[PDB]
Every structure is written in C-alpha cells, then in structure tokens.
C-alpha cells in the first residue's frame, strides 16, 4: 500500500 | 599462537586457523555480514585471500585426493583416446574427389603461363 | 529449550517497536507531494481522449505514436545516412566495394547489351 | 507483473486458468504435429534417405575393370 | 514480487492448518498457546519435524539455533511475521 | 577444433544429466551445443556451424523464458525437485517447453532438425577422428536424456511446491514473447534452409546406418 | 563403416589407402577407358562465382539451379526440380568414387594372389 | 563401511567428523566460555558506540589497524637474512630473470642468424 | 558450544533434508522419513552417555557417506539462488538525513513522523546506557544476551538498529 | 546498392538512438523499456530488407566509411562487412532480442532499476553487431571486449550478492 | 482479502499413493503422521496427471484432424492443375 522507499540523496 | 620465528616478517601476529570465511556460521549476527567478522576480532593474515569472493576451504562431499585422481584420470584417458582416433581415423569407402581442368589449376591459384602436368580423370 | 522469560519479554517489546516502525513507513494519501509542472497541450489532449479506453480510442493512439517513432527513428536517420553515404562516402575511392553480381549463361548485361552464350547441351540423364 | 488477468491465488488447490491460455496452448501444440506430419508426408526422404546406397560386392569384375587373374 | 502479501491472521490461519493436519496432535485440544512438550506431550524429535513443516509451508528456512525455541504456535507466528516484516 | 569440441560436447552433456537447478541444465545444454558447433568447424563445415547458430538461437532462448516463467510462478524456485504437476497448470509454458525440447533433441522437420542432422551426417561420412565421432554421437543421446529430465520433473507427476503458490502465466508480455519464438522454433529452420544459397556440396548418399544415427540415438 | 575392421583389425595390404589411391594406372584393366567430360567452361563457373569445391563435374546443374533461384524470387519453394538434378548428379559422382575404392580393393586383392602363386610354385 | 574423510589444505575436516567435538571435558567447556566472554565484551564495546545517536563517523577498529600494519610496516623489522630467506629471495627474485634472459637471448640469436642467411620469411613484413 | 541433545536434533534435521533430496517424490520421502525416524526412536531411551556419543559419532559418518552431493537449499538460505539478492536495495535509514529539503518536502508526513522516532531514540539513550551498567558483572558481559526493559516507559536496551533495520523486500 | 548500404547502417544507428536519448535529456522515463523494445522491432524490419536483397541476388558490400587512424603502412577504417554471415545473423539476433526484451518487461517489472537493465541489454546488442559486422581485426576486437564487459555488468546485476560478483 | 482456507477434514490419505505408503509402513509397525499434510498433492485438479508419452502428444489428435483434411484436400483438387 505504497510503502516508503529509503534511497540515498539523488538531488546532487 | 605466533608464526614460527624463521625471519619471514610475521612477528607476533597470530596464526589463526587457515579457514575461509565461507566456513563461518552464516546465521550468526555478525558485525560484518558479508565478510563474516566481528568488530575487534583478530583478522587472519590472509583475510583478503579468504573473503567469500576468493579461495574457499569448505569441506567437500568427496575427498581431495579422489577428485584429483578422477579428474586427471578422465582428462588423461580422453587425450589418449583422441590420439588413438587420430592414427586410426574413420572414412567412407570412396576414392578422392575429382576436379576438372588439371584439378582447377588456374582457379586455385597458379602461374597462367606455366602449363601444368595434365591430371585428366577417366570414367568408371 | 525455549525462550527464557527475559528473552520473551525483550522479543515482545522489540516486536511492538518493529510493527510501529513498519507502520510508519506507509505513505499518506497526499504523498508524494509533486511540485507544479508545465503540462503540455498535446499531452492534455490524449489524457481526456483516452480516459474511456475504447478500442477505437487506443487504435488511433497506437497509430499516432508508431507514426512518430517511424519518422524520427527510421525516416530521419535514413535521410542522414543516405546523404552521408551518397555525397560524402561514395565520393571516395574503394569506400563501398560490392561483390560483382553473378553472371549466369543466358543473361543480358544492362550496361552493354551483350548476351552470355548458353551452356553446352547436357549429354543425358534422368531423375 | 502489473497487468493482465487478476487470477486470485488458491491454497492447496489447482490454480485458476483462463480459457484464452488453454486454446492458444492447444492450438500451437496441434500446429506442431500438423507441421511434422505434413512435412513427413511430402519430405519423408529427408529423414529416411534419398538415394540407394550401392552395394560394392555386387558390381561385376568387368565394369570395375578387374582383369582375369591369369593375365 | 507479484505475489500476495502475508497478514498476521493469514500466517496464524496457516500455522494451525498444518498442525491440525498432524496426526499426532488432537485438533480440539489445540490453540495458539499450546506448548508442544508440555501440553501435547510431543517428543523433541517431533518439534524438529513440526518446524520443518513450517519452513516447507512458508518456503523459508528457520535456523536451528532459533528453531529450538519456537515451542508454541504463537512463537512460530511471531517469528515468521518478524522475518517477513509483517505488521498488520 | 574437432577434438576440442568433442570433449566439450560430451563432458558438458554428461554434467547436465544430474543438475537439479533448471537454469543450469539449460546452461550446460548450451555448452554442449557450442561444442557441437566447433566439431562442425573441425570437419570443415563452416557454413553448417553458422546455420546451427541461427537455429539454436530460437529454440534455446525460448527454453530460458519457459524456465523463467516457471521460476517466477514458484516464487524464485529454480530447483526442479520443487516443481511438478505444471503440465495442466501452465498450459502455454508446457507447450513452449515441449516444442523447444523436441527442437533441441532434433525432432524431424523442426528448427533444430535442419542443422543438427546435416551436421551429424556430415560427421559420419567425413575423414575425421574416430573417437571424436563417437563422443559426438554419445553426446546426442545425452541431449535427449536431460531434456526428459526437465519435462519429467518440471511438468509431470504431482506438485512438490509450497502450498500457497500464485501460478499465473496470463500476462500478454509473457505469452506474446514466447509465442513469437515458438513460431521460430517450428519454422525458422525450414525458411532459412530453403533461402540461403548452397556454398558446399552436401553429402546425401550414405549407408542407411549413418543417415539415421542422429534419429536412432535420440530415441534410445 | 565396415571396411575399417578390414584395414585395422585385418590385412592392411589388400585395403585401399585413402590418401594414396588410386595405386594402379587408370588403364590397368580397361582397354579403351574413356575420358571424363566437363560441360561447364571455366569462364562460366568463374562468372557464376562458384566455390572452388563446387567446380566439380556437376557444376552445370548447380549453375542452372542458382540461375533458377534468382528468377523464382521471392518464391523460395520453386526450383525444387533443378536442385534435385544437381543432387542426383552428385549421387552419380559419389558412386564412381565408391567403384574406385572397390576397384582398388580387388586389384590389391588380386595383386596379393600373385605373391601367393609366385612364392608357392617358386 | 565408511571411508574415512581425508582433510586437506583446501578441504577442511567437517566439524561433525572431528574427534575434538565429542570428547569435551570441563577444561574445554571452560575454554569455550572464556572465548565467549572475550567475544561478548568486544561486542558490547562496539554496540555502545554503534547505537550512539550522537556519532556520525567511523568506529575505528584496532583489529583492522593491526592487520594492515602487520602486513606492510612490520615485516622488515622482523626479518632476518638467514638461509631460508636468502635462497627464497634468489630463487624467486633472480631465478625468473635469468631464465627469461636465456629464453629471449637464444630466440633472438637464432632468428638473427636466419635473417642474415635469408632463411627467414619476411616477404610482407614492413611493420615493426 | 552444542550439547549432546542439540547435535542429535541438528543431525536429525539434516538427515531428513538430505533424504528429501534423494527421494523427490513426496510419497517415497514419507516412507523413508518414517524409517529414519525409527532409527532414532530405537535408541531414544538410551541412558549410557558414552554409548550415546558413539551412536551420534557413527551416525554423522553414515550421514557424510550418504549425503546428497547437491542438496536442496531454500532460495533465501545461505547458498541459495536468491541469497543476498536484495541487499542492493537495503539502504540504511541514516541516509535520509542527507536528503535535500526539496526531496524532503515531497514526504511531509513521513519526515514529520521520522522526527518523532528521532526524539524517542535521543531521549531514551541515557537510560539505555545506564541500565546496561547496573545489570553487567564487574568483569564484563559474559554473554551476548541483552536484558529487556525493566520499568515502564523504557525501551529495550540497544533497540534502534533492530527496529529501524531495512525491510526484507524493499523497492 | 544505394538502398542496401543505407538500410544496413540504419539498423546499427537505430539501436544507438535509445542510448543517445538517455545519456542526454530528450525523452521521458516510465516508457523506456517499451521505447527500447520498439526500436528492436523496427531494426528487425530494416535488417530484413538487406537480407532479402542478399537472398535474391547474393549481393554483398563492404562499407569503409570513416578513416580513423593510419599507422605508417597500416590504414585502419571503421569498416562494415555486410555479407552472408552478417546479413543472416543480424535479423535472427534482433528477432530473439525482440522477444527477450518484451519478456523482460514482465520479468523485471518490480525491479527498481529496470531502465538501466534495458540500457545494458541494448549496449550488449550494439557490441555484438560490431563483432558480427567487423571487417578488420581491431574493430572485431572492440565488440569482442564489449560483450565481455556487458556480461560482467549483467551477471553481477544484483551486486549485493557475493556469489554474483564472483 | 482474508483467504478462506478450505476445510482441513477433506484431506485424506485413502485413494492416493500415500495409501500404499501406509500399507507398507503399517506392515512394519509404523505410521505416517504427516500423510494428510501431503494429501492435497494427490487430490482435485492435481489428480490423474499425464504421462511422458502422453505429454509429447499434446494436440496430436487435433493436429491429425487437420492433417487428414489437408491431404484430403490434396487427393481432391489435384485434377484441376
Ligand atoms: C556506446 C557507448 C556508451 C558509453 C556509455 O554509455 O557510458 C556511460 C554509461 C553509464 O553507466 P550507468 O551506470 O548506466 O549510469 C548511471 C548513472 O547514475 C547516470 O544516471 P543517468 O542515466 O540519470 O544520467 C545519464 C548521463 C547523463 O549525462 C549527461 O547528462 C551529460 C553527458 C554529456 C557527455 C558528453 C561528453 C562530450 C562533450 C564534449 C564534446 C562536445 C563537443 C560539441 C561540438 O550520465 C551518465 O551516464 C554518466 C556520464 C558519462 C559521460 C561519459 C560518456 C561519454 C564519453 C565520450 O556507462 C555504462 O553503462 C557502461 C558501458 C561500458 C562500455 C561498454 C562498451 C564499450 C565498447 C564499445 C565502444 C563502442 C565504440 C564506438 C563503435 C566503434 C565501432 C563500431
Ligand atoms: C597463462 C594463463 C594466464 C595466467 C593467469 C591464469 C592462471 C590461473 C591464475 C588465475 C587465478 C588467480 C587469480 C586471482 C583469482 C581471483 C578470483 C578468485 O579468487 O577465485 C574465486 C573463484 C571462485 O568462484 P566459484 O565459481 O568457484 O564459486 C564457488 C562457490 N562460491 C560462490 C560460494 C565461492 O574462482 C575463479 O573464478 C578462478 C578460476 C580461474 C582459475 C582457473 C584457470 C583455469 C585453469
Ligand atoms: C515478419 C516475419 C519475418 C518474415 C518471415 C518470412 C516468411 C515467409 C512467408 C512464410 C510462408 O508463406 O510460409 C512458408 C512456410 C510454409 O509453407 P509450406 O506449407 O511449407 O509450403 C508447402 C510445402 N509443400 O513456412 C511457414 O510455415 C510459415 C511461417 C511464417 C512465420 C515464420 C517466422 C520466422 C521467424 C523469423 C526467422 C528469422 C529471420 C531470418
Ligand atoms: C584437455 C584440455 C584442458 C586441460 C585442462 C584440464 C587439466 C586438468 C588436469 C587434472 C588436474 C587435477 C589436479 C592435479 C594437481 C593436484 C595438485 C594437488 O592436489 O596439490 C594440492 C596441495 C595438497 O596438499 P595438502 O593439502 O597440504 O595435503 C595433501 C593432500 N593430498 O595443496 C597445494 O595447493 C600445495 C601446492 C601444490 C600445488 C600442486 C602442484 C602444482 C600442479
Ligand atoms: C646469488 C646470491 C646467492 C644467495 C644465496 C646464498 C646465501 C646463503 O645460502 O645463506 C648464507 C647465510 C645463511 O647463514 P646460516 O649459517 O646458514 O644460517 C643463518 C645465519 N645467518 O645467509 C646469511 O646469513 C646472510 C645473508 C646472505 C645472503 C645475502 C644475499 C642474498 C641475496 C638474496 C636475493 C636478492 C634478491 C634480488 C632480487 C632483485 C630483482 C628482483
Ligand atoms: C579501425 C576501427 C575504428 C574504431 C573507431 C573507434 C571508435 C570511435 C568512436 C565511434 C565514432 C563513429 C563515427 C562514425 C561517423 C564518422 C564521423 C565523421 O563523419 O567524420 C567526418 C568524416 C571525416 O573522415 P574522413 O573523410 O574519412 O577523413 C579522415 C578524417 N579522420 O567524413 C567527412 O569528411 C564529413 C562527412 C559527414 C558530413 C555530412 C554529415 C551530415 C549530417 C547532418 C546531420 C547530423
Ligand atoms: C548412451 C549411454 C547412456 C548411459 C548413461 C545413462 C545415464 O547417465 O543415465 C542418466 C542418469 C542421470 O540421472 P541419475 O543420476 O540416475 O538421477 C538420479 C537417480 N539415482 C539417484 C538413482 C542415481 O545418469 C546418472 O546416473 C548420472 C551419472 C552418469 C555418468 C555417465
Ligand atoms: C511508438 C512507441 C510504442 C508505443 C506502442 O506500444 O504502440 C512509443 C512507446 C514510448 C514512446 C517514446 C517515448 O515517449 C520517448 C520519446 C518521447 C517523444 O514521443 C519523442 C520520441 C520518443 C522516443 C517516443 C517515440 C514513440 O512514441 C514511443 C517509442
Ligand atoms: C563408418 O563409416 C564409420 C562410422 C560408423 C558409425 C557407427 C555406426 C555403426 C556401423 C557399424 C559398422 C557397419 C556394420 C554393418
């Protein structure tokens, strides 16, 4: 049910 | 248990069992699950050679000697039988294939000026 | 065998925290909060036109997208390659060497009009 | 994956099937045997042989050219 | 994935389903708290077989160090749920 | 090359006779077939080896998709000992897994027949190492044995997989992908064989016990 | 084959050597043996770009077959009669090779009789 | 009956077939508990800073520092030029060099002789 | 270490699992899964420790001789085809502190609730360390077992990296 | 020849379009697996046209279009050999990759990095065609090593698995 | 979606190969306590599966049905060309 995916910062 | 003092540079470093990291218990809560080590534990002199991506020492279902005999025995037997089959080939009971024009002398490369020795073929 | 009373108590206390943590990982309906976009008019048209899912709806949509792909990935590239080969590559010596076509007996050469003599009559056979 | 028939799973029971996958599967299986039988009927010589292998021990000693042993 | 998720009720409904198919356990005298070696009087060899049937049931192995502690259906349910990160 | 391929085709085929992982049986099947190609290069049949590459591309790539379909349905279970009873549960995978095996083993007039049979005949009627020829023929029999192993354990018998399994092969992407390579594994060899120009002189006249070697050994 | 058992496990002197045959002269036995014929000229095979191994005495049928295929395109099921002729000729060509092997066998088996009759009487 | 297992350098003896895992008296029972005491103390020290929420660095491991140090900087000062090292150094240090010298020197001397005599085929060799 | 009882049970599990690999078919496995059971029940009521050790010692050798060379392994177990497959996607939770505020604004609820876990961990650390000192011998912890929380409102000692660990099947 | 040459190079260039449009910003994701699968389909169609011409009249050609580097008496050009082997393997390779890529849209649907998976599948296909079409041994060596690296990147797809890296 | 597990009392070891296991296990003073847990494999749609020679012939009868018509359309229609 749309769990949060822990990812490293992709902004940079 | 330090390494023997034979002047090879080991010093007082421990001589831990020469076991790969694959043999370690995989279900234990290791500090480093991939390396299977605990923080502060002494590291084997050849730890880099005994990581799970390298030399493995885990027990085998068959003895080391018996595997070597069978693997070498297989390779040795096959090579010997490939030599027997090379000195005693298998061929169909036919004569040589026949080609025209002096065995295609000009087609297969040849001095167009020099006339070849005629190789005419007959009927049967 | 079996957990000791302290082991059961800890496993149970940790279990409550684990479930609470796993529950907190669920996204709320609002999330993700996407920022404003610059929606294009062409995209606008297809969304409403394809909200009913009719068979004659996507057939036009499928043809529309394949026509675009052919124009931008086959026709445009081949135009560039043909210009490259024709006016830049084939103008240099020994750049495109074609194996000469096979000439069989009884053929006519389109460039000189000669007729290749037929083969000598086969002696005889059947089957 | 995210698409297709929503075949609900079953517990200790035979899985649900769609009639589409049982007709396509049976069609291609029948296509295979038609091809094998059709090809066999017209091209049986490509699996059994084409030409008669001569028996050398039947050729007369004259066509081969063997002369009489006395000569 | 493309597989159905697990629920605490679903895990419980399947742990008991396997045990109720165990001819050495009486169905009616069975719940989610029956200690195997203190209520149903099972030999510790049976608990090895029972745990084996719980890893063939869910398709994941239970290590022996942690396997010889789940002496009750609930502990099996609380271990499978923890391993697969079930929370509801 | 003739001896290098002969040792490879026989050795890898022999290994596949006991592998339980499905993706490894097919992998060892591939290694056995590559050795067959190098044997063809050894008997001076370069164009037949190329044909076996084109034919082997179809019916081998399909097998991995079929095995991939089975593995995906059993929750990443790759061991054939935890398969079974999938004949009527996955009808299209079963159909594809059967055409590919028959094409692999050299069923007449499928895609594999138009390359393997010519290769075997070209090997029996050639001035070639005798031991290499025997290993090639023994490897052909081994090819049919491990094909039966996949079909028997993965499709026949009673199921041996977990209780809650979502066996579902009803995705258009999966069916369409296998469908095209199933048509190729039936007709691709025929089309190519009748369109490529002849570049050698095929050996068509031979004893009856050399024309049917590939077919007879396969049945055994 | 069966002749292999007659050359490796038997008498090696009365069996043809595939890399040296034919041993006896072409006319040894044939009084007026005819010479073989080639219907296709070199320039015709050269222009058809036949592989050197295809330029045997069956080339004329092969040339006809290849010409037919270029003209029957895209019908790849045509020219199934021209192709058959080229295959039948190769069968006839292959048969002659078999006779040469048999001719060698009998002459070799007949040249051993002299070594028996000669040493026997003398 | 049961062919005895023959351990080797690369095939360790299984822990189930080891005679040392069945004849365990109180002396070994105590030892197996002293090791766990050392292991637990080290584990506690690691966890008291691994779990610390004010830490945003690397938990320096003396065991890793000793391993890297023992492998690089501690070798020469604990080396003695005795008979073993002197022969091993020459066998692995000078041996391969001399062997490859005669392999190439002989090969080039042979080839050089042929070139001057014209016995070597260099018909199309114009790149070197 | 392992006591005598544990070795017998661990051997029993291994023998059945390897036996199940030789049998494949369930009915055959069930038939030989009960013959093997009798081999343990027969000596179940042994009282002589020395004889029991010998039986286990010879049982292990009989197992090593008859073990399957390619025993079945569950996909996720060490040695399986799916072991450690999803470690590529397990990302630690501390990586979120480096997220750009632009990325953090897309999940206002998640990071407003993750902050509460921050406070709970931060305010519970002192009591966490304090409890471990008072419940530990002078020499030091002689085992890896951790005591549970005693009072109410105190979380179990050393709980963060067991509670916030990555999920088994992330993205 | 003006069509045999152009359509033989368009197939190779068509397979590089998805790579170029992804290493740059000229497309939108969430359709990339389908976008790459569509390119293979068209490349297969374009590759069949030269193949039919070959089957018709056995036409062949060698395209040495770019002079890359000359080393004294050695001239190295980007040469393509569109012959029997190249004209009959390219259509077959694209056909199988067409099915595998469509199959992989279902097998890798849940993978977080499906887009990179298809890009790596396409890079392998590009280098295999370089190997197949190479007319000189240096260019053949480019595709010979390229296939090895893509195999390395794809075998160790799940890089957290030690056995995969090994 | 709470899956409704079917009744557990339906799983019985009579009429299945597990029956023959009990006969040869009862003949030596033993029983199969897990016989019912394995019973679902030999019951329902999974029962009476095909054999190997029967699997290879999947679709043969339909394939033969088309083949006879094809050749039937060959024997006929051959007199017009
Ligand atoms: C085809 C070659 C592809 C190379 C490649 O893709 O590398 C990057 C690619 C990136 O890998 P990735 O893991 O998918 O990237 C993920 C990142 O997180 C990136 O994530 P992302 O997808 O969101 O971002 C995409 C991209 C975004 O990149 C950008 O936004 C800008 C990139 C612009 C680069 C332009 C450089 C040149 C500009 C100056 C000249 C312009 C002058 C104008 C006049 O970022 C990158 O991929 C990294 C930049 C790599 C730049 C170096 C490659 C160019 C060198 C030339 O590398 C690989 O995938 C491995 C490929 C290994 C090569 C194997 C084959 C080599 C042998 C064959 C060579 C063929 C020779 C030609 C044929 C001759 C015979 C026929
Ligand atoms: C003249 C030839 C060129 C000289 C070099 C080649 C000679 C052989 C030396 C190369 C091997 C040693 C280089 C370092 C190896 C690094 C990788 C490694 O440790 O091996 C682990 C891997 C182990 O992989 P694995 O497939 O056995 O995995 C077993 C199971 N797990 C995954 C759990 C470990 O072995 C190799 O890949 C090396 C094999 C090549 C050596 C044999 C050459 C053929 C003879
Ligand atoms: C787009 C697809 C690629 C182009 C395929 C070209 C197909 C040519 C036309 C096919 C056809 O018309 O059928 C030919 C043949 C069946 O004809 P047949 O019944 O055997 O003839 C009577 C025999 N007495 O063969 C058939 O049975 C028809 C099968 C057609 C599908 C073939 C798919 C081949 C896959 C691509 C091969 C690789 C490309 C090189
Ligand atoms: C046909 C074309 C393809 C050809 C390729 C195939 C060829 C395969 C040929 C068969 C190879 C079989 C292996 C034969 C070499 C065996 C070497 C060996 O076993 O030594 C290992 C050695 C064991 O020593 P250790 O463990 O201390 O105790 C003794 C155990 N019996 O432990 C050691 O490692 C010590 C160093 C010794 C190294 C061995 C000697 C070098 C060889
Ligand atoms: C050619 C060089 C030959 C060197 C080998 C001969 C030296 C030798 O055999 O050892 C003599 C001596 C051993 O003394 P011993 O009484 O036997 O017991 C140890 C007490 N010192 O050794 C000694 O005690 C002192 C050391 C004498 C040897 C010094 C020179 C040895 C050269 C080592 C190889 C150098 C490697 C160079 C590689 C360069 C290219 C990589
Ligand atoms: C031996 C193995 C080699 C391996 C190579 C190593 C990998 C390198 C990376 C891959 C590069 C692939 C490049 C393929 C395209 C060729 C590039 C090109 O066209 O350059 C211009 C080219 C000049 O080359 P050339 O005439 O042969 O003279 C020698 C100069 N070096 O020709 C010209 O003079 C100009 C022709 C093009 C101008 C018209 C183009 C119009 C296109 C407009 C739309 C864009
Ligand atoms: C043509 C020659 C055919 C003769 C070989 C037949 C064969 O190899 O048979 C096929 C079988 C493969 O299955 P399996 O190992 O029996 O399966 C397991 C059943 N057990 C447990 C009863 C053995 O081979 C083998 O036993 C594997 C070793 C083959 C070495 C050669
Ligand atoms: C036509 C093709 C397949 C659609 C279908 O299933 O019918 C669709 C799938 C995704 C599309 C592509 C992607 O949207 C990315 C690009 C976006 C623009 O449409 C320009 C070309 C572009 C590269 C598209 C071309 C074409 O429309 C594509 C390739
Ligand atoms: C002979 O040509 C070598 C190839 C033989 C392959 C084995 C087939 C069996 C033939 C036995 C010899 C013939 C006896 C009738």
mmCIF file of N, CA and C and ligand atoms in Angstrom, chain B residues 22 48-49 51-56 58, chain I residues 79, chain J residues 161-164 166, ligand 2:
data_model
loop_
_atom_site.group_PDB
_atom_site.id
_atom_site.type_symbol
_atom_site.label_atom_id
_atom_site.label_comp_id
_atom_site.label_asym_id
_atom_site.label_seq_id
_atom_site.Cartn_x
_atom_site.Cartn_y
_atom_site.Cartn_z
ATOM 1 N N UNK B 22 33.750 -18.608 4.182
ATOM 2 C CA UNK B 22 32.556 -19.387 3.871
ATOM 3 C C UNK B 22 32.241 -20.389 4.974
ATOM 4 N N UNK B 48 42.279 -11.183 3.237
ATOM 5 C CA UNK B 48 41.943 -10.723 1.893
ATOM 6 C C UNK B 48 41.873 -11.881 0.906
ATOM 7 N N UNK B 49 42.660 -12.934 1.126
ATOM 8 C CA UNK B 49 42.607 -14.113 0.273
ATOM 9 C C UNK B 49 41.482 -15.066 0.649
ATOM 10 N N UNK B 51 38.254 -14.044 1.740
ATOM 11 C CA UNK B 51 36.921 -13.460 1.649
ATOM 12 C C UNK B 51 36.050 -14.396 0.823
ATOM 13 N N UNK B 52 34.733 -14.199 0.879
ATOM 14 C CA UNK B 52 33.808 -15.112 0.218
ATOM 15 C C UNK B 52 33.882 -15.042 -1.301
ATOM 16 N N UNK B 53 34.570 -14.047 -1.859
ATOM 17 C CA UNK B 53 34.766 -13.931 -3.296
ATOM 18 C C UNK B 53 36.083 -14.549 -3.753
ATOM 19 N N UNK B 54 36.721 -15.355 -2.905
ATOM 20 C CA UNK B 54 38.048 -15.876 -3.207
ATOM 21 C C UNK B 54 38.231 -17.268 -2.611
ATOM 22 N N UNK B 55 39.485 -17.730 -2.522
ATOM 23 C CA UNK B 55 39.796 -19.100 -2.114
ATOM 24 C C UNK B 55 38.816 -19.580 -1.059
ATOM 25 N N UNK B 56 38.238 -20.755 -1.293
ATOM 26 C CA UNK B 56 37.317 -21.395 -0.366
ATOM 27 C C UNK B 56 37.937 -22.680 0.163
ATOM 28 N N UNK B 58 35.909 -24.796 2.326
ATOM 29 C CA UNK B 58 34.819 -25.527 2.947
ATOM 30 C C UNK B 58 34.919 -27.018 2.624
ATOM 31 N N UNK I 79 23.623 -19.961 0.398
ATOM 32 C CA UNK I 79 23.888 -20.912 -0.659
ATOM 33 C C UNK I 79 22.787 -21.022 -1.689
ATOM 34 N N UNK J 161 25.034 -9.476 -3.815
ATOM 35 C CA UNK J 161 25.222 -10.913 -3.687
ATOM 36 C C UNK J 161 26.678 -11.249 -3.986
ATOM 37 N N UNK J 162 27.374 -11.818 -3.000
ATOM 38 C CA UNK J 162 28.784 -12.144 -3.189
ATOM 39 C C UNK J 162 28.971 -13.152 -4.314
ATOM 40 N N UNK J 163 28.106 -14.167 -4.378
ATOM 41 C CA UNK J 163 28.218 -15.175 -5.423
ATOM 42 C C UNK J 163 27.989 -14.597 -6.813
ATOM 43 N N UNK J 164 27.240 -13.497 -6.922
ATOM 44 C CA UNK J 164 27.036 -12.874 -8.225
ATOM 45 C C UNK J 164 28.297 -12.162 -8.695
ATOM 46 N N UNK J 166 31.352 -12.906 -7.735
ATOM 47 C CA UNK J 166 32.347 -13.935 -8.016
ATOM 48 C C UNK J 166 32.143 -14.524 -9.405
HETATM 49 C C1 LIG L 2 48.846 -18.456 -18.587
HETATM 50 C C2 LIG L 2 47.419 -18.102 -18.174
HETATM 51 C C3 LIG L 2 47.392 -16.689 -17.596
HETATM 52 C C4 LIG L 2 47.879 -16.712 -16.147
HETATM 53 C C5 LIG L 2 46.717 -16.417 -15.199
HETATM 54 C C6 LIG L 2 45.713 -17.569 -15.216
HETATM 55 C C7 LIG L 2 46.277 -18.766 -14.452
HETATM 56 C C8 LIG L 2 45.410 -19.072 -13.231
HETATM 57 C C9 LIG L 2 45.535 -17.943 -12.206
HETATM 58 C C10 LIG L 2 44.286 -17.062 -12.201
HETATM 59 C C11 LIG L 2 43.505 -17.286 -10.907
HETATM 60 C C12 LIG L 2 44.151 -16.500 -9.772
HETATM 61 C C13 LIG L 2 43.877 -15.009 -9.948
HETATM 62 C C14 LIG L 2 43.115 -14.481 -8.735
HETATM 63 C C15 LIG L 2 41.726 -15.113 -8.691
HETATM 64 C C16 LIG L 2 40.734 -14.113 -8.101
HETATM 65 C C17 LIG L 2 39.340 -14.737 -8.059
HETATM 66 C C18 LIG L 2 39.343 -15.921 -7.098
HETATM 67 O O1 LIG L 2 39.852 -15.817 -6.035
HETATM 68 O O2 LIG L 2 38.756 -17.130 -7.474
HETATM 69 C C19 LIG L 2 37.490 -17.332 -6.920
HETATM 70 C C20 LIG L 2 36.604 -18.037 -7.938
HETATM 71 C C21 LIG L 2 35.586 -18.895 -7.194
HETATM 72 O O3 LIG L 2 34.393 -18.923 -7.924
HETATM 73 P P1 LIG L 2 33.450 -20.271 -7.867
HETATM 74 O O4 LIG L 2 32.692 -20.398 -9.164
HETATM 75 O O5 LIG L 2 34.314 -21.490 -7.666
HETATM 76 O O6 LIG L 2 32.379 -20.149 -6.622
HETATM 77 C C22 LIG L 2 32.238 -21.241 -5.762
HETATM 78 C C23 LIG L 2 31.115 -21.009 -4.747
HETATM 79 N N1 LIG L 2 31.162 -19.696 -4.110
HETATM 80 C C24 LIG L 2 30.484 -18.708 -4.936
HETATM 81 C C25 LIG L 2 30.468 -19.783 -2.839
HETATM 82 C C26 LIG L 2 32.526 -19.258 -3.852
HETATM 83 O O7 LIG L 2 37.394 -18.859 -8.749
HETATM 84 C C27 LIG L 2 37.714 -18.352 -10.017
HETATM 85 O O8 LIG L 2 36.901 -17.779 -10.659
HETATM 86 C C28 LIG L 2 39.121 -18.544 -10.577
HETATM 87 C C29 LIG L 2 39.093 -19.625 -11.657
HETATM 88 C C30 LIG L 2 40.205 -19.396 -12.681
HETATM 89 C C31 LIG L 2 41.445 -20.202 -12.304
HETATM 90 C C32 LIG L 2 41.491 -21.486 -13.128
HETATM 91 C C33 LIG L 2 42.062 -21.185 -14.512
HETATM 92 C C34 LIG L 2 41.835 -22.377 -15.439
HETATM 93 C C35 LIG L 2 42.916 -23.426 -15.201
#
